[PDB]
Design a protein around this ligand. Structure first.
Ligand code: PNS
Length: 529
């Protein structure tokens, strides 16, 4: 029904009232919000191909393209060996020092406090429902063996700290959470570490999960099921989570099939264009250094106001019928041109990686590490013409098949005798990672973000996420997100490679060009057919 879409859109977009004529993207939608709509529909046994939502961005149009779900996923307990996925292959290939310490984290806050007994019940359901959290990793014969445990052993560690007497809540939270962050055992588990802090202003719920089994969308899913199960428990109802989508196991199995399929191999030809840019990869550094560890990384931050961010989310993409990636990367092109006099450069672009490339596979609600990464070429031709550059960036991104998911599939999954001959040793020095919007997911009726949280806990600059002795792998690590209605962009660099001021010039330049692109696009009316 259209009443179901209205409700879902309203929840997902964080907008109280939505008409059946409202444009999804003009309301602030993106491809991650789209997946969240698809996930909600799955619980109603309804199917949405997110690409339809792009062609029919209103409920009045889209209702005719919503189908019944033919796919039924594993609802029981998933167990057994699972082949590493592309981003997982990349991870082990790095051989990070203390790779057991390589996590994402988050901290929630509830002024009236959490009931601990309920939390224990809720997280038991969580690790049961979201099978990938029970993963372990073993070595057998110089090879990594990924194994999904059943309901055996310890599925998560949970600590309770009573700081209601301590006068230094922030220090203790940092010290204790750091200990959790450093205590993950990849061989026997658990990969999920949880601490509950009682304080004078309420409770703070800290969570650290090894990156091997989680990502940005997974966190959003966890937050939802956390609130849902908790709300049920405090109302003395049976804890009950939405239907499972496809398991990480089943996904990996089909992904490896795809990797060697005839249809996918035909894509190899496109990626040859990278061969024209192999010497457009390195940027100038202030200094040469041998010290390349996480402890040597610092960052510069920028942010827009709520008004500026609203324009970006709601009134910019209409100008050229773009998506936010087009805009952000166009701004980066200009910024790098003014900052280092660069005309062409190859970057590493991260995507959520949940592309409908596998048939009736649905992972809209699956917890795991699905992140894709791939080389993108930025080409600065006409610095004076915005219309030309934006349309150039747009076309460049559209010429990439299936959001670039295929490149690392070729690189890590395709068997040797089918593996195309591609420039696999290409290594961009710049990474771009825009995580998307989080306000609707973290700011609920049950809880909100913790004030004791330090920095972006879902990124590499998050406090205590990565082991300090671990090796850095990018010269410039650019990460972004929307928090409290404000776009944040951070620039992570090696302190012995660049002076802080050098990076500050890049950040300010990026902010300048981004705001200029916003003003340009705000003034351009929708005329794409
Ligand atoms: O295809 P889209 O919906 O347009 O992509 C959504 C974006 C704009 C947020 C895109 O930048 C993206 O996919 N970012 C994903 C980065 C990520 O998921 N990181 C996970 C933790 S490593």
């Amino acid at each position: 029904i259209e009443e179901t879409l209205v409700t879902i859109w309203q929840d997902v977009l964080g907008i109280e009232k939505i008409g059946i004529k409202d444009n999804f993207y003009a309301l602030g939608g993106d491809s991650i919000k789209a997946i969240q709509v698809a996930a909600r529909l799955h619980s109603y046994q309804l199917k949405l191909e997110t690409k339809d939502l792009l062609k029919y961005p209103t409920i009045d149009q889209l209702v005719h393209y919503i189908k019944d779900s033919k796919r039924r996923s594993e609802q029981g307990i998933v167990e057994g060996e699972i082949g590493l996925t592309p981003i997982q292959h990349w991870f082990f290939e790095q051989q990070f020092t203390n790779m057991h310490h390589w996590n994402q984290s988050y901290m929630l806050y509830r002024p009236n406090g959490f009931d601990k007994e309920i939390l224990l019940r809720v997280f038991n359901k969580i690790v049961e429902h979201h099978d990938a959290l029970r993963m372990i990793y073993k070595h057998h014969n110089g090879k990594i063996v990924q194994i999904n445990r059943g309901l055996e052993g310890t599925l998560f560690d949970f600590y309770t700290f009573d700081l209601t007497a301590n006068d230094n809540e922030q220090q203790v939270i940092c010290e204790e959470s750091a200990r959790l962050q450093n205590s993950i055992n990849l061989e026997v588990g658990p990969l999920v570490k949880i601490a509950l802090f009682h304080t004078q202003n309420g409770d703070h719920l800290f969570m650290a999960i090894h990156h091997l089994v989680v990502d940005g969308i997974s966190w959003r899913i966890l937050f939802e099921d956390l609130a849902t199960a908790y709300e049920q428990a405090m109302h003395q109802q049976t804890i009950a989570l939405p239907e499972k989508t496809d398991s990480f196991k089943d996904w990996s199995i089909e992904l490896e099939k795809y990797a060697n399929s005839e249809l996918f191999l035909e894509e190899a030809e496109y990626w040859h264009h990278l061969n024209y840019y192999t010497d457009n990869v390195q940027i100038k550094k202030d200094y040469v250094t041998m010290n390349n560890k996480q402890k040597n990384i610092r960052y510069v931050g920028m942010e827009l106001t709520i008004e500026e961010t609203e324009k970006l989310l709601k009134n910019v993409n209409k100008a050229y019928r773009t998506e936010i990636n087009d805009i952000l990367l166009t701004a980066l092109g200009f910024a790098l041109k003014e900052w280092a006099d660069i005309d062409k450069i190859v970057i590493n672009l991260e995507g959520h990686g949940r592309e409908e490339i596998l048939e009736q596979m649905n992972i809209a609600r699956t917890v795991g590490w699905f992140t894709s990464q791939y080389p993108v070429v930025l080409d600065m031709q006409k610095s004076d013409d915005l219309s030309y550059q934006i349309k150039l960036m747009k076309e460049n991104l559209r010429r990439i098949p299936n959001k670039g998911i295929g490149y690392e599939i070729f690189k890590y999954l395709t068997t040797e005798y089918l593996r195309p001959v591609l420039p696999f040793t290409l290594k961009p020095e710049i990474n771009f990672n825009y995580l998307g919007q989080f306000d609707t997911d973290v700011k609920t009726e049950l809880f909100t973000r913790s004030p004791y949280s330090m920095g972006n806990s879902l990124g590499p600059d998050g406090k205590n996420n990565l082991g300090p002795e671990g090796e850095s792998y990018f010269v410039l690590n650019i990460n972004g997100f929307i928090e409290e209605g404000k776009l944040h962009i951070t620039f992570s660099y090696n302190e012995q490679q660049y002076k802080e001021d050098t990076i500050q010039q890049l950040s300010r330049s990026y902010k300048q060009h981004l705001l200029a692109i916003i003003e340009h696009c705000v003034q351009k009316e929708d005329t794409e057919l």
